[PDB]
């Protein structure tokens, strides 16, 4: 068969990932420009929301050194790749869990619907990548909204999951924070309620 | 906005380290017990951020000046980012972080007794040029002990993060230095079952790129998932 | 006073580097053109100083404490001094000197741009015990550029001086570190024609002797000329 | 044939030898006890002398980073090996050349006569070992005194040198320094008047 | 690197460990002097206690063929190494589980405090080694006391265990037996409440 | 005028022949006895002439016409001039000279009894094209005796001169022909100690470039010192 | 380490280099355009000088077949790489020694000062490459002027030569020829007064 150059092997981000990718968190001075957890500026079109959650290990213990990267469509279901701080909205972001609370937070807007390659619409979702010490290669998941049941019901992606029970591991539970619309998304790396992780 | 015009060669998950590599203790509780769910590639997966307009400081990639002078062996870390087809990846984001010459990290949680270096931070970022070239100027980090087995030591290494053209290509890895006797003994390194794979992580001493009477240089090329056009889809 | 009760096995001058090794430029003008005159061993040659009564400071062998803490890789350098017959050389003087983590020496003459380390001198001395054992605590020195060819770099090394039981056994050498890629390119190292002889100069990583969560260790044994009694003279 | 363990190979002392063996010279602070150029305390028996010299390279240029070690018998032709700063006389000493003037000095006493292995007396001499950058393996020499001609004529060692003309190179030339008896012994590593170097 | 002679590889003790190390248990005649489960004679100083426990496999089933070795300080936090039946107290003992009930017992005294290499005090503890068929290499653990909460909180060893909940696994539960002070210490080899095992 | 924008990879003086190579008699008295002084690259060394505007004659590169037809094996000597990075060296000056078919040189000092060729000069020049290619048309030189040892013969060879981008790259060499049995016997060839280096001077027969029923062809590629951009200088 | 393609190995120019690079010299008809020893036309700005010298082997014998190539800055300290015979001044030239007298000549203008890579000015100098039979790889040197003592004293390159005495080998001696300003530069390949040669 034809074989290409092999892809550089992945390695854990390690415990000090912060110093490299979450300056504030490492408790180090940041630079002028930093990619962080505020994807939407107040005057950004769409329904601003607050995402938050914790990460659990196989023992049900909090992962306080986790690092997450998110990728989403704007409100029009469009991906903004030209990352710029000036931007009212950026499709990409980064967040980490508190060494204490162990919670990550993101400030953005609910993404519009985009279709798959086949042209079939996918329910609004947020692509997430999890990094941390003990994770040799990063985990891929997607966040869905509990208030989008109809759409979710018909997601070409969510339908790929054999067992329905597992699908629910993907739905964020809508709540309110300081009278603001929030959605809680807890990731269980292993065991009971293990979150669906994807390969693509 | 972005468009779904490419497809990315599927990852070879026997090349990369598996999730569960028991010698690396933490992997035990932090690895899934269910199989990953494979899904077709869509716009969600085949696009990613383009950091072309990020505002880089003048010394962003110069660890010697971005934090007097750090103590430690002055080296240039340079190389190219290419895809599996051998195509350069221009304007991509490369972020690195490491410990100092003593193996001490500038982080709260780092309690190793080697002292911090007042002139050393340990973070750099560089966007590859049109030929997929990147370069850093830093000091060779020191190995450091860690709570794994009773006497585990990380080989000297620089942590790396590469964006690539999509979230499907994003990668985090580690660079190791040629000849370091600790490499074969590290359980993290050993999470990679193919010796051949491990070699891809070893930076080669590059005398050609050194600045005589100033600093040495190491070459570290990176390969991301090959990107191709869709066909008969 | 000393007594002429011993003979030392003749030195193998094809093992040791020769005087004229042109690649090492300074050896050109600093090597004799006449052959050495061999002479029988006498009391003059077979005796030497005994440093048993030199008053050593408590930290003479601890470079970490003898000059805060130095920046760099904390290592213990230990080994044994034996003669060619494999007999230990007890109560002998082992003196060492080296550069700091960045390849800079604490010496007037060292103009290298790497900074000095405020907490490091780079001198150590230790008297072998009853089993010919020695140990020093220090930081792994960095490689350094030097004015030889336009782009020569000395591999990281630690200068060593050993007395032995006589002036006949007195030796000055250099310890090199296992796996260092600079070794095979150094003209000073290459003054030694036999690759096998080169190996003797390489300290091996010694995980067994390391202090977990503190410092690594290197092992470097030293073989001095074989000492035998006189016979049928 | 029988092969023993190979001896550890020699390497150049390098230009910074001072740092490890000639502390003052390096321009660094010394320790309580140092091995230096004063073999004899003023109250030591024998004829006190001042020794000095320069070291020339093959081009006739001074070698300013030389390092030397000496070994001599006391005034009674006795080797005093128990080195002690307390002793009035030590058989062993160290010196180095000034980076400026390029001259070395030793403060000792004129050695008494010692016999060779055959019971034959050798002329009074000082055993010298020279180290320096560019010197891969230390050069061995002997310093004899011009005022001991009779003894010199019959030395079994000096007699081993084929050409009488080369014997001359080993003879220190008596002089006076501040009304003190001095002997000047210059070393020519290479070329015209190259000093005899031994192997033993 | 430097390599020493490799240690002799361990092998399971097997089901018949009792014939070799727990004579009575095997249901065999014992020898004159046997190493058993009574570390303290009645007149030994310190507080006399009874230690008891059960061993659990990963299915929650009693491991009835386990063999245990204990090492602890006397009441003064002193390790008594010269083993002798004449002694009032021996720092070393041996126990095993009943084929019936599956419970082991030890008669000793509450150990005194011992400092770690760094000079820091360790809470009162008993070093345990667990052997049995199915165990390739013996399991090392420590028994701490629930009535030493203050000390426990500051144990440099207990503190090395990242998850607070795992620490609980090392704490013996004070009870009474025939009006005697007893502590129960159950070992869970695998699963829910898995006991912490050490490497040193 | 010329600009100090470049650095050139340091020459490997153990790859090139040494100055003193006794079997090549002339070298004894024409080789320095002092070591070469290493100097940092400056504008002086990193620049050189550009012969783009030199007015080349139409048959400058054609030895069959530039002096009737010469007698001898009609050949084409073509190749590419590249640096150590594999980068073409466009618009560079390639100059050659050789003897005739009989090994006779059209030079005063040549007393060999092989006659001159009425139609043969023996000099050529060519400026490399945009891709670093050059070509000459000439006749295969004959070997010839020389006063070295008592029966020394140079293999058939073409003398070549290549300018390159700077005086630091400037080179003078000799092309030898594949299979010439005289190759391994030549003291000039052998001034080069590595046999692998020798291989580099051997032109390969190239039937793909020959003109059927006219002339054969040989291929000779030349590698000049690698040119890099200065960095962190 | 990384290894690039090896540079094509040098070979001696041989005794007949003239046929290739100095047609006149070979006693051969020259081409329309030739690279010779007249860097400057009379109407060129700067101080017009005549350079001359002889080359000596290790025996003190004249090397009558040497070939020289020169590179120098114009009078402004500027490197004129665009070689053209139309130019008033070319920075590059070639010369060779007479088979008779054994002397080469060059017609140029005195070069102006140029700064090294560090911004430090170099004394006016002419870069020279020497070629000839017996010379396997060309020898690099520099010609400085005796009448620039002040500049010479501070040349960073000149200052790299360890021994002051050797620096003098690089200084051309000012003289007059036919009432013209000339400098004589003799190269001694080996032995007494051996010319310093560089590696870069
Ligand atoms: O503890 C870990 O998982 C750990 C420690 C240090 C590293 O450099 C790393 F990558 C991981
Ligand atoms: O990779 C493995 O070893 C692996 C993966 C999933 C499982 O559920 C498992 F038990 C093992
Ligand atoms: O070892 C050598 O190469 C050597 C020694 C002495 C000489 O005079 C000489 F020319 C060469
Ligand atoms: O210049 C020298 O000779 C030199 C420099 C540095 C060293 O460490 C050494 F051994 C020699
Ligand atoms: O059942 C077992 O595990 C078993 C039986 C016999 C042995 O000798 C042994 F080592 C193990
Ligand atoms: O290359 C050599 O062998 C060489 C070079 C310079 C000298 O002075 C010498 F004696 C030998
Ligand atoms: O005599 C010489 O040195 C000589 C002769 C012919 C050649 O082709 C050459 F390269 C050298
Ligand atoms: Fe790390
Ligand atoms: Fe050194
Ligand atoms: Fe059995
Ligand atoms: Fe020729």
């Amino acid at each position: 068969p034809i074989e290409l150059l092999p892809e550089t092997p992945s390695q854990t981000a390690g415990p000090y990932v912060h110093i490299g990718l979450a300056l504030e968190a490492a408790g180090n001075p940041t630079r002028d420009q930093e990619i962080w957890n505020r994807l939407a500026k107040p005057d950004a079109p769409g329904e601003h929301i607050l995402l938050l959650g914790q990460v659990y290990d196989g023992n049900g213990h909090l992962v306080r050194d986790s690092f997450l990267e998110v990728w989403q469509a704007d409100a029009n279901g469009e991906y903004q790749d030209a990352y710029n701080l000036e931007n009212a909205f950026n499709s990409f972001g980064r967040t980490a869990t508190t060494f204490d609370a162990g919670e990550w937070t993101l400030h953005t807007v609910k993404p519009g619907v985009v279709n798959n390659a086949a042209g079939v619409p996918m329910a609004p979702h947020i692509n997430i990548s999890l990094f941390a010490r003990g994770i040799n290669i990063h985990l891929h998941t997607r966040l869905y909204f509990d208030d989008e049941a109809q759409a979710n019901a018909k997601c070409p992606v969510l339908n790929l999951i054999e067992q329905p029970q597992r699908r629910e591991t993907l739905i964020a539970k809508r709540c309110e924070v300081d009278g603001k619309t929030a959605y809680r998304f807890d990731i269980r790396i292993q065991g009971e309620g293990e979150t669906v992780f994807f390969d693509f | 906005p972005a468009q779904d015009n490419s497809r990315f060669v599927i990852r070879d998950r026997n090349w990369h380290p598996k999730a569960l590599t028991p010698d690396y203790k933490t992997s035990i509780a932090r690895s899934p017990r269910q199989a990953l769910v494979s899904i077709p590639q869509s716009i969600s997966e085949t696009t990613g951020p383009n950091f072309s307009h990020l505002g880089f400081g003048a010394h962003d990639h110069d660890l010697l000046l971005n934090f007097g002078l750090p103590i430690g062996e002055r080296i240039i870390v340079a190389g190219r980012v290419v895809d599996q087809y051998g195509k350069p990846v221009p304007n991509t984001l490369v972020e690195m972080w490491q410990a100092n010459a003593g193996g001490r990290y500038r982080h709260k949680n780092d309690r190793y007794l080697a002292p911090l270096d007042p002139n050393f931070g340990g973070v750099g970022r560089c966007l590859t040029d049109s030929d997929g070239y990147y370069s850093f100027r830093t000091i060779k980090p020191g190995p450091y002990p860690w709570r794994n087995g009773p006497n585990d030591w990380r080989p000297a290494h620089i942590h790396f993060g590469i964006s690539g053209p999509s979230i499907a290509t994003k990668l985090i890895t580690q660079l190791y230095f040629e000849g370091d006797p600790l490499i074969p003994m590290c359980p993290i390194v050993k999470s990679i079952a193919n010796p051949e794979a491990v070699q891809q992580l070893i930076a080669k001493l590059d005398m050609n790129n050194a600045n005589p009477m100033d600093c040495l240089a190491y070459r570290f090329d990176i390969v991301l998932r090959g990107q191709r056009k869709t066909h008969f889809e």
Side-chain angles (χ1 to χ4, degrees), chain A residues 1-172 174-200, chain B residues 1-2 4-228 230-233:
Chain A
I2 302 288
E3 301 298 29
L4 265 32
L5 302 176
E7 181 192 16
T8 298
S10 166
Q11 296 273 254
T12 178
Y16 313 116
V17 60
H18 297 127
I19 103 189
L21 310 167
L23 289 56
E24 25 55 42
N28 294 330
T30 36
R31 287 154 291 197
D32 284 325
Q33 300 191 22
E34 306 281 346
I35 298 147
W36 196 243
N37 72 340
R38 169 147 265 129
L39 284 69
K41 273 171 176 201
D43 64 294
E47 180 175 8
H48 303 225
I49 61 178
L50 159 51
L51 299 163
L52 85 291
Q54 299 176 296
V55 185
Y56 302 86
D57 70 16
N59 301 313
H61 298 142
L62 284 182
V63 174
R64 301 175 189 257
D65 44 26
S66 49
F67 169 83
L68 282 78
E69 308 192 321
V70 295
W71 180 246
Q72 52 157 114
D74 62 18
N76 296 334
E78 234 154 45
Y79 285 104
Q80 305 296 339
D81 61 340
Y83 190 91
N84 192 309
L85 291 183
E86 282 172 341
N87 282 357
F89 173 94
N90 288 288
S91 277
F92 184 78
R94 304 216 269 209
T95 191
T97 62
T98 71
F99 313 141
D100 56 296
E103 206 159 62
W104 54 265
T105 70
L106 199 64
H107 303 278
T108 189
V109 306
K110 210 182 201 201
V113 159
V114 308
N115 305 338
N116 74 9
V120 171
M122 293 191 284
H125 62 276
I126 303 191
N127 302 294
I128 301 195
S129 294
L130 178 73
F131 314 72
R133 88 166 211 281
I135 297 169
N136 295 327
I137 183 154
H138 66 281
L139 304 174
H140 298 301
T141 204
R142 264 178 184 208
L143 178 179
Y144 291 96
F145 308 91
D146 66 348
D147 59 25
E148 297 277 3
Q150 284 172 220
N152 298 343
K154 298 197 167 305
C155 191
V157 165
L158 212 46
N159 288 286
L160 281 175
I161 305 175
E162 279 219 43
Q163 289 305 331
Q165 320 65 196
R166 299 203 78 211
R167 275 166 203 161
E168 294 160 32
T169 79
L170 296 201
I171 297 86
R174 193 168 185 199
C175 51
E176 198 140 316
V177 162
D178 306 288
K180 174 177 192 179
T181 324
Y183 294 92
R184 195 191 182 64
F185 185 71
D186 289 350
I187 295 177
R188 311 202 151 65
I189 300 168
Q190 173 187 123
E192 210 191 358
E194 190 178 310
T195 307
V196 179
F197 298 117
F198 300 115
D199 184 8
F200 54 77
Chain B
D4 174 33
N5 63 25
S6 291
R7 295 267 174 281
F8 295 91
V9 167
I10 303 303
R11 268 202 173 101
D12 175 353
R13 282 174 196 275
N14 285 295
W15 179 251
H16 282 287
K18 295 315 202 140
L20 169 69
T21 61
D23 290 342
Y24 178 15
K25 299 176 173 202
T26 302
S27 80
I28 298 166
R30 306 185 174 189
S31 55
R33 296 288 179 268
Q34 293 296 308
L36 294 191
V37 169
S38 317
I39 65 161
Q41 286 179 19
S42 80
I43 183 139
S44 282
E45 301 81 32
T46 73
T47 60
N50 172 314
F51 304 104
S52 270
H53 304 119
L54 181 55
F56 308 95
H59 296 334
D60 278 6
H61 60 133
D62 183 358
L63 285 68
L64 264 47
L65 307 186
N66 80 7
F67 177 71
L69 251 22
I71 284 167
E73 311 168 31
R74 300 162 57 85
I75 57 169
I76 290 142
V77 182
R80 235 193 164 196
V81 186
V82 301
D83 81 356
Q84 294 177 273
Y85 294 93
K87 170 188 182 185
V89 179
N91 309 113
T92 219
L93 188 58
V94 177
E95 293 159 298
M96 61 98 104
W97 65 101
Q98 56 170 100
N100 69 14
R104 176 73 185 290
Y105 279 95
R106 189 183 272 291
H107 189 307
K108 304 171 133 204
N109 302 153
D110 189 19
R111 300 304 97 210
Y112 179 43
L113 94 222
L116 276 171
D117 175 343
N119 294 115
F120 201 68
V123 189
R125 32 142 83 143
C126 172
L127 190 92
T128 59
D129 71 16
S130 49
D131 280 313
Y133 283 99
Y134 79 79
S135 91
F136 298 104
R137 181 222 227 181
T138 184
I139 56 147
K140 185 149 187 276
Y144 64 93
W146 67 300
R147 304 234 95 128
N148 194 59
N151 190 34
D152 277 347
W153 297 71
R154 297 287 342 275
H157 61 282
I158 288 165
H159 296 259
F160 269 81
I162 312 87
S163 69
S166 82
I167 64 164
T169 61
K170 160 45 170 248
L171 186 73
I172 277 156
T173 196
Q174 295 174 46
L175 176 159
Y176 309 105
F177 303 78
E178 164 167 33
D180 188 343
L182 281 170
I183 298 168
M185 319 193 202
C186 175
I188 292 176
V189 173
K190 284 177 287 177
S191 71
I192 298 184
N194 185 338
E196 299 132 333
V198 175
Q199 287 289 322
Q200 281 202 255
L201 299 189
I202 294 158
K204 319 309 174 174
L205 178 67
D206 183 355
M207 304 299 291
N208 309 296
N209 229 20
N211 284 345
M213 298 301 301
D214 168 4
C215 61
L216 283 166
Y218 279 83
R219 175 83 193 201
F220 175 76
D221 285 345
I222 295 153
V223 175
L224 302 176
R225 291 168 72 170
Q227 185 185 4
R228 63 159 182 84
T230 62
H231 52 39
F232 308 89
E233 279 200 20

